[PDB]
Short mmCIF file of C-alpha atoms and ligand atoms in Angstrom, two decimals:
data_model
loop_
_atom_site.label_atom_id
_atom_site.label_comp_id
_atom_site.label_asym_id
_atom_site.label_seq_id
_atom_site.Cartn_x
_atom_site.Cartn_y
_atom_site.Cartn_z
CA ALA J 4 12.11 -57.97 17.78
CA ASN J 5 10.51 -55.15 15.41
CA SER J 6 10.87 -51.37 15.78
CA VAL J 7 8.21 -49.45 17.51
CA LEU J 8 5.97 -48.20 14.97
CA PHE J 9 3.80 -45.14 14.55
CA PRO J 10 -0.39 -44.65 13.45
CA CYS J 11 -0.94 -42.34 11.04
CA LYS J 12 -2.07 -39.36 12.62
CA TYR J 13 -5.63 -39.60 10.28
CA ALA J 14 -5.87 -42.75 12.58
CA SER J 15 -9.02 -41.79 13.18
CA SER J 16 -10.55 -41.41 10.15
CA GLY J 17 -9.91 -44.73 9.08
CA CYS J 18 -6.46 -44.73 8.80
CA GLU J 19 -5.81 -48.04 9.76
CA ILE J 20 -1.78 -47.88 8.63
CA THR J 21 1.58 -47.86 10.91
CA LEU J 22 4.54 -46.91 9.89
CA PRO J 23 8.93 -46.46 11.42
CA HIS J 24 8.53 -42.46 12.33
CA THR J 25 11.38 -41.41 9.14
CA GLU J 26 7.45 -42.04 6.58
CA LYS J 27 5.36 -40.88 8.99
CA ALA J 28 5.29 -36.83 7.83
CA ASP J 29 6.00 -38.44 3.79
CA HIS J 30 3.13 -41.20 4.05
CA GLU J 31 0.26 -38.18 6.21
CA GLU J 32 0.94 -35.50 3.59
CA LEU J 33 -0.27 -38.67 0.94
CA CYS J 34 -2.73 -39.99 3.03
CA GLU J 35 -6.18 -40.09 1.31
CA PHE J 36 -8.09 -40.28 5.32
CA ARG J 37 -6.74 -37.08 5.61
CA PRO J 38 -10.32 -35.44 6.70
CA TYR J 39 -11.56 -32.04 5.36
CA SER J 40 -13.67 -28.87 6.62
CA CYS J 41 -17.36 -27.42 3.72
CA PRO J 42 -14.90 -24.23 3.14
CA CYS J 43 -18.52 -22.64 2.85
CA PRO J 44 -18.75 -20.02 4.73
CA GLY J 45 -19.05 -19.91 7.49
CA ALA J 46 -20.94 -21.53 10.08
CA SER J 47 -24.09 -24.15 9.05
CA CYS J 48 -22.16 -26.95 7.25
CA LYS J 49 -20.64 -29.46 9.88
CA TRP J 50 -19.54 -31.39 6.31
CA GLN J 51 -15.65 -33.06 6.63
CA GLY J 52 -14.84 -35.46 4.13
CA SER J 53 -11.36 -36.23 1.63
CA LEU J 54 -9.26 -32.97 -0.31
CA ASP J 55 -11.31 -34.56 -3.62
CA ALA J 56 -14.09 -35.28 -2.08
CA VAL J 57 -14.77 -31.20 -1.80
CA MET J 58 -15.07 -29.69 -4.75
CA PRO J 59 -17.91 -32.63 -5.10
CA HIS J 60 -19.38 -31.45 -1.40
CA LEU J 61 -20.16 -28.03 -3.15
CA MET J 62 -21.42 -29.23 -6.37
CA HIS J 63 -24.25 -31.44 -5.13
CA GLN J 64 -24.69 -29.46 -1.10
CA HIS J 65 -24.15 -26.02 -2.29
CA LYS J 66 -26.16 -25.13 -5.31
CA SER J 67 -26.14 -21.39 -4.85
CA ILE J 68 -22.49 -20.95 -5.84
CA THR J 69 -21.25 -20.38 -9.30
CA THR J 70 -18.33 -21.27 -10.94
CA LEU J 71 -16.66 -19.30 -13.28
CA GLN J 72 -14.44 -20.55 -15.85
CA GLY J 73 -10.76 -18.40 -16.15
CA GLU J 74 -7.86 -16.98 -14.84
CA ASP J 75 -8.98 -14.14 -15.56
CA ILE J 76 -13.15 -13.09 -14.20
CA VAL J 77 -15.27 -10.33 -13.20
CA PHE J 78 -16.75 -11.26 -9.73
CA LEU J 79 -20.57 -8.90 -9.55
CA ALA J 80 -21.26 -9.00 -5.89
CA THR J 81 -25.95 -8.14 -6.70
CA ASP J 82 -27.25 -6.36 -3.73
CA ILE J 83 -24.09 -5.53 -1.17
CA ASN J 84 -27.12 -3.06 0.52
CA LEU J 85 -29.47 -4.89 1.21
CA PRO J 86 -29.23 -5.55 5.40
CA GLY J 87 -27.33 -7.83 7.34
CA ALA J 88 -24.51 -9.59 7.68
CA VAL J 89 -24.24 -11.28 4.03
CA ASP J 90 -22.09 -13.40 2.50
CA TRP J 91 -21.02 -14.01 -1.33
CA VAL J 92 -19.22 -17.00 -2.92
CA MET J 93 -18.17 -17.83 -6.23
CA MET J 94 -15.36 -20.74 -7.25
CA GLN J 95 -12.75 -20.04 -10.07
CA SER J 96 -11.55 -22.91 -12.39
CA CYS J 97 -7.77 -22.44 -13.68
CA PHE J 98 -4.46 -23.86 -13.54
CA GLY J 99 -6.35 -27.19 -12.80
CA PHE J 100 -8.19 -25.92 -9.18
CA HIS J 101 -10.59 -24.93 -7.99
CA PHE J 102 -9.85 -21.12 -6.48
CA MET J 103 -13.19 -20.14 -4.37
CA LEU J 104 -13.24 -16.49 -3.87
CA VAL J 105 -15.78 -15.22 -0.76
CA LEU J 106 -16.37 -11.90 -0.28
CA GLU J 107 -17.76 -11.36 3.19
CA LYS J 108 -19.91 -8.43 4.55
CA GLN J 109 -19.60 -7.79 8.38
CA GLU J 110 -21.43 -5.18 10.99
CA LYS J 111 -19.56 -3.41 13.74
CA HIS J 115 -21.53 0.68 10.54
CA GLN J 116 -20.45 -2.25 7.96
CA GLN J 117 -16.90 -3.74 6.30
CA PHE J 118 -16.55 -5.99 3.73
CA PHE J 119 -13.77 -8.87 4.09
CA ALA J 120 -13.11 -10.13 0.26
CA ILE J 121 -10.18 -12.85 -0.38
CA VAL J 122 -9.36 -16.58 -2.46
CA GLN J 123 -8.49 -20.08 -0.96
CA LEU J 124 -7.66 -22.54 -3.14
CA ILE J 125 -9.35 -26.28 -2.64
CA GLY J 126 -5.51 -27.40 -2.31
CA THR J 127 -2.25 -27.57 0.08
CA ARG J 128 -0.20 -24.70 1.39
CA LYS J 129 2.78 -25.64 -1.36
CA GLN J 130 0.31 -25.59 -4.12
CA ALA J 131 -1.60 -22.08 -2.59
CA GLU J 132 2.37 -20.82 -2.17
CA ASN J 133 2.76 -20.76 -6.68
CA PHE J 134 -0.10 -18.57 -6.68
CA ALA J 135 -1.12 -14.46 -6.43
CA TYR J 136 -4.68 -13.67 -7.18
CA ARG J 137 -5.30 -10.17 -7.81
CA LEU J 138 -8.85 -8.35 -6.09
CA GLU J 139 -10.14 -5.52 -8.21
CA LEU J 140 -12.76 -2.47 -7.22
CA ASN J 141 -12.89 -0.10 -10.69
CA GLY J 142 -14.72 3.31 -10.90
CA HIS J 143 -14.70 6.05 -12.49
CA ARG J 144 -10.54 6.69 -12.19
CA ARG J 145 -10.48 5.21 -9.17
CA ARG J 146 -8.98 1.80 -8.32
CA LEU J 147 -7.93 -0.44 -5.41
CA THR J 148 -6.28 -3.76 -5.70
CA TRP J 149 -5.13 -6.30 -3.35
CA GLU J 150 -2.55 -8.92 -3.93
CA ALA J 151 -1.54 -11.75 -2.13
CA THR J 152 -0.98 -15.90 -2.07
CA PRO J 153 -4.88 -17.86 -1.61
CA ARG J 154 -4.60 -19.00 1.49
CA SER J 155 -5.41 -22.99 1.18
CA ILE J 156 -8.68 -24.27 3.09
CA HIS J 157 -7.10 -26.12 5.56
CA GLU J 158 -5.35 -22.67 7.01
CA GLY J 159 -9.18 -21.48 5.76
CA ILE J 160 -10.27 -17.76 5.54
CA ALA J 161 -11.38 -16.50 9.70
CA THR J 162 -8.40 -16.24 10.38
CA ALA J 163 -6.48 -14.30 7.82
CA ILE J 164 -10.52 -12.19 8.34
CA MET J 165 -9.19 -11.62 11.92
CA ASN J 166 -6.34 -10.47 10.82
CA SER J 167 -7.61 -8.09 8.27
CA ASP J 168 -4.92 -10.07 5.08
CA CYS J 169 -7.28 -9.66 2.19
CA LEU J 170 -9.21 -6.59 1.31
CA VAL J 171 -10.63 -4.97 3.16
CA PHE J 172 -13.49 -1.88 2.52
CA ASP J 173 -16.08 -0.21 4.19
CA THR J 174 -19.47 1.31 2.69
CA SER J 175 -18.05 4.27 1.60
CA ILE J 176 -15.79 2.00 -0.60
CA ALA J 177 -18.33 0.04 -1.63
CA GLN J 178 -20.52 2.58 -2.81
CA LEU J 179 -18.20 4.34 -4.94
CA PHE J 180 -17.37 1.40 -7.02
CA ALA J 181 -20.64 -0.03 -6.84
CA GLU J 182 -23.34 0.48 -10.29
CA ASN J 183 -27.58 -0.30 -9.97
CA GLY J 184 -26.48 -1.68 -6.28
CA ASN J 185 -24.35 -4.02 -6.91
CA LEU J 186 -20.40 -4.13 -6.93
CA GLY J 187 -18.05 -5.78 -9.38
CA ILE J 188 -14.47 -7.80 -7.77
CA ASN J 189 -12.22 -8.31 -11.41
CA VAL J 190 -10.71 -11.57 -9.82
CA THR J 191 -6.64 -12.41 -11.51
CA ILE J 192 -5.07 -15.93 -10.43
CA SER J 193 -1.29 -15.71 -11.46
CA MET J 194 1.49 -18.08 -11.76
CA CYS J 195 4.66 -17.11 -9.61
CA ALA R 4 -26.42 50.98 -19.99
CA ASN R 5 -27.09 52.26 -16.62
CA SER R 6 -25.69 49.91 -13.74
CA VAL R 7 -25.35 48.28 -9.89
CA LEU R 8 -21.74 47.26 -9.61
CA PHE R 9 -21.29 45.10 -7.08
CA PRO R 10 -17.47 44.22 -5.65
CA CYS R 11 -15.68 40.97 -6.30
CA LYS R 12 -15.95 38.30 -4.13
CA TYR R 13 -12.37 38.07 -3.11
CA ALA R 14 -12.71 41.87 -2.52
CA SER R 15 -11.16 41.48 0.94
CA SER R 16 -8.09 39.79 -0.49
CA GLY R 17 -7.23 43.25 -2.38
CA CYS R 18 -9.20 42.67 -5.71
CA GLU R 19 -11.34 46.53 -6.44
CA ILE R 20 -13.35 45.44 -9.54
CA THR R 21 -16.45 45.57 -9.48
CA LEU R 22 -18.90 44.89 -11.65
CA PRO R 23 -22.75 44.55 -12.59
CA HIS R 24 -23.98 40.97 -11.68
CA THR R 25 -24.06 39.81 -14.78
CA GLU R 26 -20.31 39.58 -14.72
CA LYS R 27 -19.45 38.72 -11.41
CA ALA R 28 -19.31 34.88 -11.96
CA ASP R 29 -17.87 35.46 -15.09
CA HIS R 30 -14.93 37.44 -13.66
CA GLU R 31 -14.74 35.13 -10.09
CA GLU R 32 -13.35 32.09 -11.38
CA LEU R 33 -10.53 33.69 -12.84
CA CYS R 34 -9.87 36.45 -10.08
CA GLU R 35 -6.06 36.55 -9.35
CA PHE R 36 -7.44 37.18 -5.37
CA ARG R 37 -8.94 34.02 -4.63
CA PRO R 38 -7.97 32.35 -1.52
CA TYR R 39 -6.41 29.23 0.26
CA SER R 40 -6.29 27.66 3.58
CA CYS R 41 -2.35 26.66 4.63
CA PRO R 42 -2.83 22.78 2.75
CA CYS R 43 -0.72 21.10 5.60
CA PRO R 44 -3.09 18.57 7.97
CA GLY R 45 -4.90 19.25 10.35
CA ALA R 46 -6.63 21.96 12.19
CA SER R 47 -3.17 24.55 13.41
CA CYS R 48 -2.31 26.64 10.65
CA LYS R 49 -4.80 29.47 10.25
CA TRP R 50 -3.05 31.27 7.64
CA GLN R 51 -5.02 31.70 4.14
CA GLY R 52 -3.29 33.33 0.02
CA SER R 53 -3.29 33.49 -3.45
CA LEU R 54 -2.68 30.55 -4.79
CA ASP R 55 1.11 31.97 -6.10
CA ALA R 56 1.11 32.30 -2.79
CA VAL R 57 1.06 28.74 -1.52
CA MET R 58 4.40 27.23 -1.43
CA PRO R 59 6.04 30.57 -0.22
CA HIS R 60 3.85 30.76 2.83
CA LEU R 61 5.29 25.58 2.68
CA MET R 62 9.02 26.95 2.29
CA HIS R 63 8.89 29.24 5.03
CA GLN R 64 6.40 28.17 8.13
CA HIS R 65 6.49 24.39 7.31
CA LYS R 66 10.45 23.54 7.22
CA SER R 67 10.12 20.38 8.57
CA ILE R 68 8.53 19.35 5.34
CA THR R 69 10.10 17.52 3.59
CA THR R 70 9.90 17.62 -0.91
CA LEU R 71 11.71 14.83 -2.75
CA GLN R 72 11.63 15.49 -6.65
CA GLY R 73 10.81 12.34 -8.35
CA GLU R 74 7.78 10.99 -10.11
CA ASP R 75 7.74 7.67 -8.21
CA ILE R 76 9.96 7.69 -4.89
CA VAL R 77 9.33 6.24 -1.43
CA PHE R 78 7.80 8.22 1.55
CA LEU R 79 8.52 6.38 5.16
CA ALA R 80 6.56 7.79 7.38
CA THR R 81 8.10 6.53 10.59
CA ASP R 82 6.93 5.16 13.79
CA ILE R 83 3.79 4.42 12.74
CA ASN R 84 2.66 2.57 15.60
CA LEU R 85 2.26 6.25 17.86
CA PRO R 86 -1.16 6.50 19.16
CA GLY R 87 -3.21 9.01 18.27
CA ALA R 88 -4.33 10.82 15.76
CA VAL R 89 -1.42 11.42 13.88
CA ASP R 90 -0.28 12.94 10.01
CA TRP R 91 2.77 12.93 7.64
CA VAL R 92 3.46 15.32 5.14
CA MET R 93 5.52 15.55 2.49
CA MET R 94 5.84 16.98 -0.83
CA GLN R 95 6.13 15.62 -4.24
CA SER R 96 7.81 17.72 -7.56
CA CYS R 97 7.55 16.40 -10.74
CA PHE R 98 6.47 17.60 -13.64
CA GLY R 99 6.30 20.83 -12.90
CA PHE R 100 4.00 21.22 -10.07
CA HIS R 101 4.00 20.36 -6.31
CA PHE R 102 1.97 17.24 -4.58
CA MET R 103 1.32 17.08 -1.22
CA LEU R 104 1.14 13.10 0.32
CA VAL R 105 -0.59 13.36 3.40
CA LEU R 106 -0.81 10.05 5.41
CA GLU R 107 -3.51 10.56 8.31
CA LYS R 108 -3.84 8.27 11.18
CA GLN R 109 -7.12 8.88 12.57
CA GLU R 110 -8.81 7.35 15.96
CA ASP R 113 -14.38 3.90 18.29
CA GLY R 114 -12.43 0.78 18.66
CA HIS R 115 -10.76 1.57 14.96
CA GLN R 116 -7.37 3.15 14.16
CA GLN R 117 -7.33 3.25 10.68
CA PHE R 118 -5.31 5.03 8.40
CA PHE R 119 -6.08 7.32 5.06
CA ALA R 120 -3.97 8.20 2.63
CA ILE R 121 -4.07 10.81 -0.02
CA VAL R 122 -2.34 12.94 -2.86
CA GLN R 123 -3.27 16.54 -3.58
CA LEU R 124 -2.29 18.65 -6.53
CA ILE R 125 -1.02 22.58 -5.11
CA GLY R 126 -2.96 23.77 -7.73
CA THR R 127 -6.21 23.28 -9.45
CA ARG R 128 -8.90 21.60 -10.04
CA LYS R 129 -8.82 21.11 -14.06
CA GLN R 130 -4.81 21.25 -13.64
CA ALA R 131 -4.91 17.82 -11.38
CA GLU R 132 -7.22 16.68 -13.73
CA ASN R 133 -4.13 15.64 -15.97
CA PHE R 134 -3.24 13.49 -13.30
CA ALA R 135 -2.87 10.68 -11.70
CA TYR R 136 -1.06 8.67 -8.29
CA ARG R 137 -0.71 5.28 -7.41
CA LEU R 138 0.07 4.39 -4.05
CA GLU R 139 1.61 0.98 -3.01
CA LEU R 140 2.37 -0.53 0.04
CA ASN R 141 4.48 -4.11 -0.59
CA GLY R 142 5.17 -6.85 2.13
CA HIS R 143 5.84 -10.01 1.78
CA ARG R 144 3.85 -11.34 -0.90
CA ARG R 145 1.36 -8.64 -0.21
CA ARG R 146 0.41 -5.33 -2.04
CA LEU R 147 -2.74 -2.93 -1.61
CA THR R 148 -2.66 -0.16 -4.23
CA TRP R 149 -4.95 2.63 -4.53
CA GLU R 150 -5.13 5.01 -7.51
CA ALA R 151 -7.12 8.07 -8.48
CA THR R 152 -6.36 11.80 -9.19
CA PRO R 153 -5.59 13.80 -6.78
CA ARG R 154 -7.31 16.77 -5.63
CA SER R 155 -7.14 20.26 -5.48
CA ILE R 156 -6.03 22.48 -2.85
CA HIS R 157 -9.94 24.11 -3.60
CA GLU R 158 -11.39 20.85 -2.55
CA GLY R 159 -9.26 20.05 -0.23
CA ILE R 160 -8.75 15.94 1.70
CA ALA R 161 -11.10 16.54 4.26
CA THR R 162 -14.08 15.71 2.57
CA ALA R 163 -12.42 12.98 1.16
CA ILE R 164 -11.22 11.01 3.78
CA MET R 165 -14.68 11.15 5.53
CA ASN R 166 -15.79 9.39 2.49
CA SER R 167 -12.83 7.23 2.05
CA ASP R 168 -12.69 8.16 -1.23
CA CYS R 169 -8.32 8.10 -0.92
CA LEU R 170 -5.69 4.70 -0.02
CA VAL R 171 -7.63 3.07 3.66
CA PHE R 172 -6.53 0.75 5.72
CA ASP R 173 -6.36 0.14 9.33
CA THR R 174 -3.52 -0.82 11.96
CA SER R 175 -3.89 -4.54 11.50
CA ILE R 176 -3.48 -4.70 7.72
CA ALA R 177 -0.68 -1.94 8.09
CA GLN R 178 1.31 -4.86 9.98
CA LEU R 179 2.19 -6.70 7.15
CA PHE R 180 3.91 -3.40 4.89
CA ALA R 181 5.94 -2.05 7.97
CA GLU R 182 9.34 -2.53 8.51
CA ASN R 183 10.80 -1.41 12.25
CA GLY R 184 8.47 0.46 12.89
CA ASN R 185 7.71 2.06 9.88
CA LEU R 186 6.10 2.06 6.48
CA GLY R 187 7.06 3.18 2.93
CA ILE R 188 4.65 4.02 0.31
CA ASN R 189 5.19 3.71 -2.92
CA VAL R 190 3.71 7.32 -4.40
CA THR R 191 3.84 6.63 -8.71
CA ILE R 192 2.49 10.44 -10.32
CA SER R 193 1.54 9.94 -13.93
CA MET R 194 -0.06 12.29 -16.69
CA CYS R 195 -2.91 10.97 -18.20
CL1 CL U 201 -16.75 11.85 -8.93
CL1 CL U 202 -4.81 1.42 -16.60
CL1 CL U 203 -14.86 29.43 -4.14
ZN1 ZN U 204 -2.74 -42.84 6.90
ZN1 ZN U 205 -20.99 -27.55 3.52
ZN1 ZN U 206 -11.82 39.47 -8.44
ZN1 ZN U 207 0.00 27.12 6.73
#
């Protein structure tokens, strides 16, 4: 009688629908049951939810994250020299989306990694570029790349140095009064 | 009137001026006998000479250093994945001056590259210039901009202080092609 149907790959998240194979990828791309992990670095939070639930999750459970508005902002990371492994996290709203800016300090001497991810898909992220600048007297260091999508996350890119990477000596060249300004410009491409 | 005279600090390099102590500093700041070390990295050439002897030295003794003439050039450093300590050097001619571009690969579980530009000239001359180093890859760009160091300052202190373009062997793979790394060097007047 009927042909063989496939479960949606998000059946374990509650997705009841079964589909012919040709329709399966189309459906999973749009499935509201698709789970996303909390994108706030790094280990604490075990929340999972839908893509449209991520920004509300951040607003309700991570109140220390600020959200600036605009495509060209300044990310002031304060107290870059106070001891340990440390994270700074900020959201940036522009182009109808929210981008998360992360600066992570790792101990090795210390080094810093700065990266941007979009609360959105890879196909959406590929329409943007982000630029991180450090500005100092007669000095400028700039990184430009495509934002990571939250499904991809940022840990892999940081492991690969595929982001702005700089040491304590660099941070000191650019810091003022113990704080480091990072200019962040999101553009369409 | 009566006076105790002192030799210029560059007497050993040929300066025969002797002067009262109060005017010694004023002379030495403009004295043409001031020696400069060979600016070519890292440690093997011991030559020293006056500023006007530096370009003839590089041309006589360091013939494998290539020069490109232009304000906006591509420095192609070949074989960037060679292990250990490695230097690449070339000269860029523009605005009436010569600039030395250096890429240094150093080796703690961290090989890192340092790229920096020095003017064959004085600090005062270098202050009129800016340089931009850009690495370009697929949907990626890493840029450093700064004032070139003068050859009297050298580049060792800047490299020690990461006051230059600094990148590891992992991020280099984003920019390398065929095992080589193109660095765009643009010099401008400010
Ligand atoms: Cl300075
Ligand atoms: Cl500018
Ligand atoms: Cl001196
Ligand atoms: Zn589904
Ligand atoms: Zn969370
Ligand atoms: Zn003299
Ligand atoms: Zn020499």
